Amino acid sequence: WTFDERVAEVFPDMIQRSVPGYSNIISMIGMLAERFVQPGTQVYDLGCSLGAATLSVRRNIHHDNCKIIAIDNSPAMIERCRRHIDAYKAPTPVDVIEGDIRDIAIENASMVVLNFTLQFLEPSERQALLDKIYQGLNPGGALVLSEKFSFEDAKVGELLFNMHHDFKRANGYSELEISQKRSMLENVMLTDSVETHKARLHKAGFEHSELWFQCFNFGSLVALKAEDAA
Template identity: 60%
Template sequence: MNKDQIYADPLGHIQDFRFDSTVVDVFPDMIQRSVPGYQTIIQTIGKLTARYQQPDSRYYDLGCSLGAATLSMRRNIRASGCEVIGVDNSEAMVARCQSHLQAFRSDVPARAELGDIRQVQMDNAAMVVSNFTLQFLPPEDRDLLVQRIYQALKPGGIFVLSEKIVEADTTTHDLLIDLHHDFKRANGYSELEISQKRTALENVMRPDSKSQHQARLEAAGFSHISVWFQCFNFCSLVAIKQGAAA
């Protein structure tokens, strides 16, 4: 696993963050050292897959990156007639994800597609995952995507949404940011790396609050919604479409 040193040296001009080949090469290290609870989220996606799987269904990983959630779903599907589809708009990510899928043998078909998750055709879904992806979309596009996810899910289907969040209260918001920065320091990131990474992300990542996510899910039609995980300013929600599984 290559070490993330993208922002280790002073940069005269900090470009907006992109999921290019440079990021792909260090992404496993970056995500482990930057996102608290990431492995717990990936492992739990597998457990949720086992619990909510339905035969003859599709499982979507929107913003699949290297395919951690894609693989977690695939490993836990025992129902017949299923397929897993990862979608990402980074060519470098999709290529690496596809190689990971090919390296793990399974009877469950799985593929990674290059595309815009706002335009991907989804249907007959038992499960949809969006892991730290919605926050990179323009805010005005988020409601429609969640509505499309709801419509694509079968009755009893599940949506897992993991996101970085903001707090409406400035005191607790600042506290969670400080705790997250402490987490990154403990994992070996310098003050320079933390500062430069934050600058690179500020124009491309615009997080919502938990209440915004919950309101969006309710507006789409989900009636069973819960924040099942939170560590600092990172959380994961589960939303279940009403109705018995087929």
């Protein structure tokens, strides 16, 4: 699997047909941004792809002097992402950076989004990234962490695999040329349970976290840094 030009071309339709609840989570990210993005601060869209989460945050910022930093290590994604974000006017500028989220600093951040990105790192790298995000968020800041989950209960995992299978069938996933290769990707991805995600978030320092969305085997957590945090 590579996030190449072909993937960047079909990405919005690929993700729509394969991630149950994706558009709801994009909407939820924007709603959160209205309440959590602070004046004069930064928001990070980590593994931004074509910038869908970036643009949903950006439409919901009504403060001056914010900036969104959208980062992805796929050159094809970045090229399309920069052009795509340039198509829409807003007062908040976006820095679209080709780079690795394992390396980038998190500074003066009121919000950070990992919208189906952490799953692409090696499992052993996940904690360091979440630790870095917690440290770089300002007090009162929020992280949104959306993932495909695994399930400890194998019978429940099977049911949710089947539901995902039926969802893809209902949405004509197999019409897409990329669908076999995407399925091959998902078959080798290493996903964590909700409990595992909550534990890492706690370990990184987040004083409050919770699952705020789920649909079958996909979902999203929101984690808040306390307003009185050190």
